[PDB]
Amino acid sequence: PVKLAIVFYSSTGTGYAMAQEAAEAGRAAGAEVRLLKVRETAPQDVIDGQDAWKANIEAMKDVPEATPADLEWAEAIVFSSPTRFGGATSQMRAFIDTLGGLWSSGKLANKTFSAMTSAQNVNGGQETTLQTLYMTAMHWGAVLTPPGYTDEVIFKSGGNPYGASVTANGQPLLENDRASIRHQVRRQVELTAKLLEGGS
Amino acid sequence: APVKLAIVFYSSTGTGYAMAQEAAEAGRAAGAEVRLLKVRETAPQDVIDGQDAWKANIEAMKDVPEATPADLEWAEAIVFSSPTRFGGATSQMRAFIDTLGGLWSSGKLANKTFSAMTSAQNVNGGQETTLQTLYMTAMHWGAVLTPPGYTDEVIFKSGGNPYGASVTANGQPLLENDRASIRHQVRRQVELTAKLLEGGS
Amino acid sequence: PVKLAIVFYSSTGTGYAMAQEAAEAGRAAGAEVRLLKVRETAPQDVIDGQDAWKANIEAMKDVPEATPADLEWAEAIVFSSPTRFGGATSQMRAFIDTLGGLWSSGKLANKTFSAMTSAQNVNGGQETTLQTLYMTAMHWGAVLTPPGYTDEVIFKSGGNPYGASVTANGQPLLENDRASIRHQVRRQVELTAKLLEGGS
Amino acid sequence: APVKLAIVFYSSTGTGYAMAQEAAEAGRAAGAEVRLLKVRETAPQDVIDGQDAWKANIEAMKDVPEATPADLEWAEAIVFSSPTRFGGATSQMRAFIDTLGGLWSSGKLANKTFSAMTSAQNVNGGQETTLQTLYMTAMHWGAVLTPPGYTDEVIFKSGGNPYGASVTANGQPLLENDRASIRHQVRRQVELTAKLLEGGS
Numbered sequence A, C: 001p002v003k004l005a006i007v008f009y010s011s012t013g014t015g016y017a018m019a020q021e022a023a024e025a026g027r028a029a030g031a032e033v034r035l036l037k038v039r040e041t042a043p044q045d046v047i048d049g050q051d052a053w054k055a056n057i058e059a060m061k062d063v064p065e066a067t068p069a070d071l072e073w074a075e076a077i078v079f080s081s082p083t084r085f086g087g088a089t090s091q092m093r094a095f096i097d098t099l100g101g102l103w104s105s106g107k108l109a110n111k112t113f114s115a116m117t118s119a120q121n122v123n124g125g126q127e128t129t130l131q132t133l134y135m136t137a138m139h140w141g142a143v144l145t146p147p148g149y150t151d152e153v154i155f156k157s158g159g160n161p162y163g164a165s166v167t168a169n170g171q172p173l174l175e176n177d178r179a180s181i182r183h184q185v186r187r188q189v190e191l192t193a194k195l196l197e198g199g200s
Numbered sequence B, D: 001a002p003v004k005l006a007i008v009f010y011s012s013t014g015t016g017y018a019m020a021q022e023a024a025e026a027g028r029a030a031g032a033e034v035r036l037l038k039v040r041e042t043a044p045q046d047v048i049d050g051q052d053a054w055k056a057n058i059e060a061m062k063d064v065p066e067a068t069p070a071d072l073e074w075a076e077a078i079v080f081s082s083p084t085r086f087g088g089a090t091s092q093m094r095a096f097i098d099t100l101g102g103l104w105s106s107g108k109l110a111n112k113t114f115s116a117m118t119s120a121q122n123v124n125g126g127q128e129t130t131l132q133t134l135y136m137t138a139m140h141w142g143a144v145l146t147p148p149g150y151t152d153e154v155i156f157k158s159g160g161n162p163y164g165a166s167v168t169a170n171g172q173p174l175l176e177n178d179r180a181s182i183r184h185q186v187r188r189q190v191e192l193t194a195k196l197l198e199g200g201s
């Protein structure tokens, strides 16, 4: 089976819900899935200042912490990050800035990569942030597999061809977004399988 | 003198023309001298024919002058507006941009303030990345970029696009929140360009 | 065998030099290749002003115009346009804009896509232009195979992981640029093989 | 009073630091009040220890103070400089940017002028995209962006990067054309900011 790593950062929990959805879709497609969280860097008396975040950290207590070896293990990669001024979060970048030795070893090459984001406003960096996450993947020599428009479910969720994206109001995920997420991952598993298949 | 504002738009089916007009009127209200300017339809007639709203929009813009380099040489504030074509500006919009080669070489585009707008079928299908290419382009000129950011409450009301006014096209009269975020973007730009010119001489 | 469509624009011939380089690289890899010029739109009075322009149009007089059915045909794709203020040329965009029908029949997904470009300055849009061509292919749900740093030639030619990029200076194509175009094509054909062949 | 210029930079091994210093001198010459500000280091000792160039440069910047939101509240003009890390800015630069939510929330960054610079081991290795992301970030604040464009010969001679000064970090001393450009971009920015502030005294 295909080995799928889902590396997500999430402060207040939207990204966690998204990552959870992706993992279910991966499993559903016969994939071997790791759900991995990105290490929190923020001081405790920052986290302590808002409830959602404190709560979400506790909810993800039993989720393992991502590390470069999970990407070496993985054949398909999915990065998910809330936006922070149109780019990805610093927590996520800190994790990326530690893939140097794994990069020079050449072991990042040829993994499948896609991406996901969330933001407050429909147009508050929901495209650009993925764009940064896709630039980052190119330097590895990944094969990038965004969903694009390849279904009516994309249209019905707000139409984001670059990757799944969620308007984060605190409210639970819309089923049009889950459907958009389930598609992107399932699409990516199926390609990754073909790649490996024809590679003997 | 007042601020010399040029609004250069493309529009096949009219959402672009809708926004442009509002942006033009926002500059007029804010005291600018304003020119509304359509980008030339390059498409061939038989292709245009198979789309009625396209045909109708071209008639509807019969009396709007075509954008020219002379018009950007003239202006101190520039606003570009184009529908997304696969996450980037339209081929027409870009054809005009390619005629600005000489103006560039004169240094006659530097310091002119620039901002932009777009529209698309879907809410996320290039409504940010299309603007990003047009701003990426203004930087080659030395333009002084004035995107709206979150500097008003009415940007949050429209979908919160800090890069510039973006609108979801659905053959429906522009929504009121979209117009507000346009108006603020333009008025901001004009208020900033005024300040620029003053402290100059 | 793999069907490779190299679709390029050029005014003064840098584009065309590179595109030929790519096309012969693909032939050598065992792909069935189509080298395809993008249609010239510029008014004939503009063209008659530059000598290197009039002559390049003459050189390519025997090269076929690209058409949406070429991208329906091809399983792997390479787009190559010179920069125009950090973005692709209006001609390149003109051709892209004729793909809407072929887009809504979904008939553009699952094709591999990489890009190339040429600029006058080394930092004058050799990256931002490739980023925009890649952005377009995401809307089609193409599978992006940028070369990354997967070869010592890439470092030896400026180190553009997004795609081969040349600093136009009127000269003939440098050797290292020849070789990173080769590697970029060589790679994508190899990948497309493993994707078609393992997908029956 | 003169222009308040904040030059906030990150650097592991001196390239970013040497660039940021040159920008500082340029800003003083131009007649601005200048603060050179290092982006707080956040990497764990152990991996720092791996590299002694990293360590030596951290020591070398003992008396350069650490950047703070205060320093940007203060600034009428801002310059950001981060080396490239797989195409985007370093996690450190981002971590700093991430602390600005308070300033942003009370629009306390709006209408400040803004430019970026960077460095990278490879010449086509994200010396344009890494600046592009720092500019995206600045647009969310509603900051007037003043990139250098091709507004002077020195930019052509030093690479032709109209987005911001970029440097190929190879160990060697900062080349004479790189510095000509760093100076220019800043020099230009100080002048433009003055025109803004005079324009609503």
Ligand SMILES: Cc1cc2nc3c(=O)[nH]c(=O)nc-3n(C[C@H](O)[C@H](O)[C@H](O)COP(=O)(O)O)c2cc1C
Pocket (backbone or CB within 6 Å): A009, A010, A011, A012, A013, A014, A015, A016, A082, A083, A084, A085, A086, A117, A118, A119, A120, A121, A123, A124, A125, A168, B160, D097, D098, D099, D100, D101, D140
């Ligand atoms: C410092 C910071 C900057 C932010 N900038 C933006 C902004 O760029 N645009 C936007 O729509 N949301 C912005 N947000 C909101 C987050 O992107 C949003 O809350 C996120 O999607 C929540 O997802 P999470 O629950 O997984 O953390 C910002 C949040 C923080 C605190």
Ligand SMILES: Cc1cc2nc3c(=O)[nH]c(=O)nc-3n(C[C@H](O)[C@H](O)[C@H](O)COP(=O)(O)O)c2cc1C
Pocket (backbone or CB within 6 Å): A159, B010, B011, B012, B013, B014, B015, B016, B017, B083, B084, B085, B086, B087, B119, B120, B121, B122, B123, B124, B125, B126, B169, C097, C098, C099, C100, C139
């Ligand atoms: C070939 C072409 C490409 C298009 N690409 C997109 C797209 O990528 N995303 C999207 O949401 N809509 C897309 N559309 C829809 C147009 O962006 C939309 O209809 C346009 O904004 C309408 O503007 P107008 O009324 O001013 O002509 C595309 C349409 C055509 C012509």
Ligand SMILES: Cc1cc2nc3c(=O)[nH]c(=O)nc-3n(C[C@H](O)[C@H](O)[C@H](O)COP(=O)(O)O)c2cc1C
Pocket (backbone or CB within 6 Å): B097, B098, B099, B100, B101, B140, C009, C010, C011, C012, C013, C014, C015, C016, C082, C083, C084, C085, C086, C118, C119, C120, C121, C122, C123, C124, C125, C168, D160
């Ligand atoms: C109007 C136009 C805009 C241009 N903009 C840039 C630019 O932004 N940066 C740059 O380095 N070169 C620029 N150039 C130069 C072209 O990128 C360069 O001449 C081209 O790569 C030549 O290759 P070709 O013969 O295949 O067309 C521009 C040229 C024209 C005609």
Ligand SMILES: Cc1cc2nc3c(=O)[nH]c(=O)nc-3n(C[C@H](O)[C@H](O)[C@H](O)COP(=O)(O)O)c2cc1C
Pocket (backbone or CB within 6 Å): A097, A098, A099, A100, A139, C159, D010, D011, D012, D013, D014, D015, D016, D017, D083, D084, D085, D086, D087, D119, D120, D121, D122, D123, D124, D125, D126, D169
């Ligand atoms: C993990 C990491 C990623 C890097 N990625 C790139 C890159 O993709 N392209 C490049 O040209 N250099 C890359 N480099 C090199 C740095 O960009 C370069 O050495 C930078 O100038 C650091 O110099 P400074 O700390 O003295 O400012 C990378 C270095 C590290 C730490």
